[PDB]
Amino acid sequence: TARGIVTDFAFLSPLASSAASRSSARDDKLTALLAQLDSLTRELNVVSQQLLDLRQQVSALKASSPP
Amino acid sequence: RQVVDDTKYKDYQQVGILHQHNNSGFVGYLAPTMREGQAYPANFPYPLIG
């Protein structure tokens, strides 16, 4: 099966094609950038939280051996 | 119903709506407008009888 002929008046309208291309570019930008930024922010938050906890543990260990 | 068997037919041609001329010269192009074009044999309905 295959189903698409909707490009009829798209061919009949160059402006519609240009607007569709702009919409595709904007969708690419939005989707890709937002997904990447969200994943990066999640990873950075998790790593920062773990780093803070490890820093606390190291501070405690340093304090518990007063040379 | 039955349709054209594209695999088994020797001369199959997947023709989109944009290029099916039937009733040419008597019906507007892809829209219920006034008649346009010239008379011509037709391409689309692939015969299944005869």
Curated annotation (Swiss-Prot), chain A:
Instruction: Kindly list any coiled-coil regions of this protein.
Output: 30-57
Q: What induces it?
A: Expressed in the intermediate phase of the viral replicative cycle.
Which top-level group of life is the source organism from? Viruses
Subcellular location per the Swiss-Prot or TrEMBL entry: Virion; Host nucleus
Q: What is known of its domains?
A: Three N-terminal domains of hexon-interlacing protein form triskelions between hexon capsomers.
Q: How does it assemble?
A: Homotrimer. Interacts with hexon protein; this interaction tethers the hexons together. Self-interacts with adjacent proteins. Interacts with kinesin light chain KLC1; this interaction leads to capsid disruption at the nuclear pore complex during virus entry into host cell.
Role of this protein: Structural component of the virion that acts as a cement protein on the capsid exterior and forms triskelion structures consisting of three molecules that stabilize three hexon trimers at the center of each icosahedral facet and fixes the peripentonal hexons. Dispensable for assembly. During virus entry, recruits the anterograde motor kinesin-1 to the capsid docked at the nuclear pore complex thereby subjecting the docked capsid to a pulling force.
Q: Which family does it belong to?
A: Belongs to the adenoviridae hexon-interlacing protein family.
**Additional record remark:** This protein is only encoded by mastadenoviruses, and may therefore play a role in mammals tropism.
What is the protein name given in its UniProt record? Hexon-interlacing protein
Give the species this sequence originates from.
Human adenovirus C serotype 5 (HAdV-5)
Task: Provide the gene name from the record.
Answer: IX
Interval of the full protein contained in this chain: 71 to 137 of 140
UniProtKB/Swiss-Prot annotation, chain B:
What is its induction behaviour? Expressed in the late phase of the viral replicative cycle.
Q: Which domain of life is it from?
A: Viruses
Q: Where in the cell is it found?
A: Virion; Host nucleus
Instruction: Give the protein's biological function.
Output: Major capsid protein that self-associates to form 240 hexon trimers, each in the shape of a hexagon, building most of the pseudo T=25 capsid. Assembled into trimeric units with the help of the chaperone shutoff protein. Transported by pre-protein VI to the nucleus where it associates with other structural proteins to form an empty capsid. Might be involved, through its interaction with host dyneins, in the intracellular microtubule-dependent transport of incoming viral capsid to the nucleus.
Per the record, the similarity remark reads:
Belongs to the adenoviridae hexon protein family.
What additional remark is attached to this entry? All late proteins expressed from the major late promoter are produced by alternative splicing and alternative polyadenylation of the same gene giving rise to non-overlapping ORFs. A leader sequence is present in the N-terminus of all these mRNAs and is recognized by the viral shutoff protein to provide expression although conventional translation via ribosome scanning from the cap has been shut off in the host cell.
Q: How does it assemble?
A: Homotrimer. Interacts with the capsid vertex protein; this interaction binds the peripentonal hexons to the neighboring penton base. Interacts with the hexon-linking protein; this interaction tethers the hexons surrounding the penton to those situated in the central plate of the facet. Interacts with the hexon-interlacing protein; this interaction lashes the hexons together. Interacts with host dyneins DYNC1LI1 and DYNC1I2; this interaction might be involved in intracellular microtubule-dependent transport of incoming viral capsid.
Protein name per UniProt = Hexon protein
Organism expressing this protein natively: Human adenovirus C serotype 5
The record's gene field reads: L3
